[PDB]
Write a protein that binds this ligand. Structure first.
Ligand code: SF4
Ligand code: SF4
Ligand code: FES
Ligand code: FES
Lengths: 633, 633
């Protein structure tokens, strides 16, 4: 089972699933082999009913699509649609939060409110919204209307691009025509230009894809901005992770998905109903997190993280998961079928994300508390149905220090230099105590033994004094393997990095260092890493493509992650990817994405399936940036 | 070659292509066989990097996607993305016209203007825009701003849905939650809900698809509305079609694509430059149409139609095509490679639609005349390069009477009843002179011998007194086979239909009948057929799903046509489709689309590959509607 997952709690549950005859994501993957080589290489097109078309990677016919689409056109069109689909997910998330904030300040949903006034005002200033002499709800109404306006064409480009990146970067992107005009406008234009008989030039197609990836960045940044206004900016928190955070004697309720507009309510209301749970024979309600909505409530409230991504079915296999509350994205629909065996109540809540066989509870922000109580009562009923029955919760969990929003990181640094908080960080980059910064982002992928790339690359970078930050299931992988526990700094971190984490941690009074890896939040909270890197770029007076900063989507899966990797390249980062996307069927497209895009944006994809080699390549990219600034390396 | 195309001019050019070694769309199709059965049936998913996933239609594993996506989920998700891509094409077209009208009335592009004042005012009234005491440019600015507002969420739903359909139909759709909130909003939400780990319920997925198809209908209707304001509402015109409209001694210039914002200018400017063409040794500039931009200028100006869809390469094979001026959609990218053999200058003009190897001329509405002159001068240069060389233009062409906008049809009927123009049509439906109405729409498809389904079904319906209207490449197929020539009414039309076409034609002074098939324009001009059917429904006091009206996408190919077929079903029409879309891998999805959707919208897909059987089924559907109204059949 260690060929399937490096997580020992997951391995234990894979044994339970095997002996109980419950098919898992790994079993379904095994049943899919060998996977289609045309699809693997990107040499397949189904964009019209003359298809399906395919192109042999090598050899004889077919060599070209029926309409004349070449391999490079077919590969670029498919990749563009993946980017647009990822942009659509992140921006749907952000749109839902924009409507929630508008409802809250128009008095239509009293469960929601402005919780971070300082964030609201700083966002309004960044956007150029007047704050002096304005009521908070009037400022917030204006911020929410600005968010919704970025989805369509208007007099300005997308402000959640142009106001969040350094001006030198905005000029570089503007020169290549890469600034999005509207978030949904770009998504629609990708679907148009990639339809049959439209754009048929690989360079033109990929430039459209870069622009659409910035529409995705805007959705990510908007989502983080609006969630912080509504629910609070994260600050350092202590909690736990892995399956051992489940409690056999509690009502165990997992929040799963990405949008916390509902799950934040679940956390608050669950506290209200401890007594109703206690009346049913439980110790209380144990809310636990799966995937990014789990990251959201972990970051803000210290909700323990149960599991992530590829291993999400294993939480159910314990027999102790009474409810799984879903909003949307990255939910394996298998959970609805597995629940018939494990007894878990799977609850969908979003009209556009239903699963056959799951109970649906319509959630409306206007009725959020009432909906949360109906849902938690279904969970309490389920707990009663298993009272006195044996469960198998692996007794495996890690300590997790998290909550490193960019505001939190700047605040922590300010204890070393109050008026220039970024300078202590840059000082240690320059003197070599910090070699560079690496962001781990993105998913797990059944093709990769779970967490193996994340932990292997992270171990090598940390020993080389790289400051490592993480989001999404990359943060999930690292937190489940102990990388967010400061007790592991001595074993994991090089001497220079250790000194810096210790100096910052002690100056914030902890008597101990920051954790080896800084958890920066959910997938949309990759925007937080952008805010930090952009602040560093501005403080240094350079563009992002001169900073010793790289990214690694080491085990990525989702169209959302393809979008994120692409805008990491677009804003100027060397970006490692650890699973082949469908590009190898076109050498010209591969060459653009791995080499010649350097000349457009300064970033580039680093394709490397072997994580030991990936770490070497990421260190090489970091060190080349160091040399370009004239630093020793 | 008659297995490839029933068009004799196309057959002649296929022989020329064969002996000159020029590979055609039919050759590329032959090189693709056998096509992938997973893709043909819809049982393939590439929506994340754990893929590609496939499901065996029958037999053993794989039976389910790696994430747990069932066959019905995978089939519904793929179909939804095709609808969204079609909506994105039609609405990108409409958006470009909305910006052009806004530029024109803001004094920023003097080549464009309000040419149809009556249409502008009627649209403004339909939308609730005040006209009394307003300047035309102020009304038009308001209409253009309303068009752009329908692309995003706002206080109202998409008005180019709710104001164009009968109120009973809007209520039925509203009851099922099918009214679009914004055009690009719906496209984005489809891409979101169909991404990995999101919507996983086939009925929920397909309901989203119906709503997105109405976003496509709105783009179609907006495109027709705005093009008529800018360029004039079509009225009956006489011209010719097929390859014999090319002139060996003229500069032959094809306008190809869908958006006529440029091609309408080409038509006007080409007249200006007859003398510059004559100085180069040509008789003049012979502008001819391919695909829907050809239909646009055929409908408004009588520009002869050269060819359509699947056979578009054959116009180049004559050796006489000096330029091919492209905007976007349905352009085989092969034309850029074929031009190296035929000498044609292929010119792209739209930033999001380039073809490697084609000359690009940036077109801006602000500089439209100057751009048109640069382009036509490249064409004149190309004519010079072939002076004195032999060409092979098939001496084959048909007479085409066209220009039947819905306003034109109502005007023609008004000569029989001035104050109640629809009543003469309904009178003849009731007495059986007109059995019903059939709209032929959509593409040709290399899988079907070109035009064979269109002409075979049309012949049988016309003999049974069905009033036949047509758009796009369906109009193209019928016009190239003589169905728009009134001299063929005696051979083609049943006695009752003949009497009606004769009575209307004579009352409009022609001394002769209307043509056997009424050409209603381009693919977006399917909205004209909706306007006509909705007027009939309102005059009769019933909903569209009670009218003896059907549609046939007999040889369809493009994602745009999938969208059109879906909204034909959504607004309540029995809708025949003559090529299998990728649905047969899911019986539940097939059953929803062919049977149970009747209970939602009253329309339904009729899948029939055999055109003789298709005609029987379409007559059966028409006659069932007749019986439901209590009419004899
Ligand atoms: S768009 Fe071209 S390559 Fe794609 S399925 Fe259609 S004919 Fe084949
Ligand atoms: S979304 Fe599911 S079915 Fe599709 S490729 Fe990914 S794992 Fe396979
Ligand atoms: S041929 Fe397998 S992905 Fe299309
Ligand atoms: S397996 Fe052929 S279309 Fe994917």
């Amino acid at each position: 089972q260690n060929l399937k997952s490096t997580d020992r709690a997951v391995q234990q549950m894979l044994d339970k699933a095997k002996r109980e005859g419950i098919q898992t994501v790994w079993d379904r993957y095994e049943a899919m082999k060998p996977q289609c080589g045309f699809g693997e290489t990107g040499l397949c097109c189904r964009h019209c009913l003359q298809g399906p078309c395919r192109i042999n990677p090598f050899g004889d016919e077919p060599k070209v699509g029926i309409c004349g689409a070449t391999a490079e056109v077919i590969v670029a069109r498919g990749l563009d649609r993946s980017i647009a689909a990822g942009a659509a997910g992140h921006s749907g998330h952000a749109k839902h939060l924009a409507h929630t904030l508008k409802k809250a300040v128009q008095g239509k949903a009293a469960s929601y409110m402005i919780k971070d006034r300082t964030k609201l005002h700083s966002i309004a200033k960044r956007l150029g919204i007047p704050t002096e002499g304005q009521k908070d709800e009037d400022i917030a109404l204006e911020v929410a209307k600005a968010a919704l306006a970025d989805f369509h064409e208007k007099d300005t480009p997308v402000l959640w691009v142009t106001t969040v990146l350094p001006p030198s970067r905005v000029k570089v992107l503007s020169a290549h025509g890469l600034i999005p005009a509207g978030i949904d406008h770009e998504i629609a234009e990708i679907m148009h230009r990639t339809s049959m008989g439209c754009d048929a030039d690989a360079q033109n197609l990929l430039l459209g894809g870069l622009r659409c990836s910035l529409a995705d960045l805007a959705g990510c940044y908007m989502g983080t901005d609006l969630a912080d206004i509504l629910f609070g900016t994260p600050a350092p928190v202590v909690t736990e992770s892995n399956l051992g955070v489940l409690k056999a004697d509690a009502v165990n309720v997992a929040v799963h998905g990405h949008n916390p507009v509902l799950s934040d309510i679940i956390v608050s209301v669950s506290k209200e109903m401890e007594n109703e749970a206690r009346a049913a024979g439980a110790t209380g309600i144990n809310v636990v997190g799966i995937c990014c909505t789990g990251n959201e409530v972990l970051m803000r409230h210290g909700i323990p993280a149960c599991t992530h991504s590829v291993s999400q079915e294993m939480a159910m296999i314990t027999g102790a998961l009474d409810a799984m509350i879903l909003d949307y994205q990255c939910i394996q629909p298998s959970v609805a079928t597995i629940a018939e065996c494990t007894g878990t109540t799977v609850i969908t809540t979003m009209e556009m994300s239903k699963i056959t066989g799951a109970t649906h509870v319509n959630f409306a922000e206007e009725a959020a508390v009432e909906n949360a109580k109906q849902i938690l009562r279904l969970a309490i009923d389920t707990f009663k149905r298993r009272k006195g029955k044996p469960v198998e919760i692996p007794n495996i969990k890690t300590k997790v220090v998290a909550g490193f929003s960019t505001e939190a990181i700047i605040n922590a640094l300010s204890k070393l230099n109050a008026n220039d908080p970024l300078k202590p960080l840059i000082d240690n980059v320059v003197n070599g105590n910090i070699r560079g910064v690496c962001l781990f982002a993105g998913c797990n992928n059944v093709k990769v033994p779970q967490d193996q790339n994340f932990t292997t690359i992270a171990r090598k970078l940390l020993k080389q004094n790289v400051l490592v930050v993480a989001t999404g299931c990359g943060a999930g992988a690292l937190m489940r393997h102990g990388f967010m526990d400061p007790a592991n700094v001595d074993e994991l971190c090089g001497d220079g990095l250790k000194a810096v984490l210790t100096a910052i941690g002690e100056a914030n009074g902890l008597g101990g260092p920051l954790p080896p890896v800084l958890h920066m939040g959910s997938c949309v909270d990759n925007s937080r890493a952008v805010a930090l890197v952009a602040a560093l770029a501005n403080r240094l007076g350079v563009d992002l493509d001169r900073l010793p900063v790289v990214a690694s989507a080491a085990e990525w899966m989702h169209e959302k992650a393809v979008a994120i990797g692409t805008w990491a390249v677009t804003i100027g980062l060397p970006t490692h990817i650890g699973v082949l996307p469908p590009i190898t069927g076109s050498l010209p497209v591969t060459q653009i994405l791995t080499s010649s895009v350097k000349d457009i944006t300064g970033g580039y994809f680093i394709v490397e399936l072997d994580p030991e080699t990936a770490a070497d390549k990421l260190l090489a990219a970091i060190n080349e940036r160091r040399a370009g600034l004239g630093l020793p390396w």
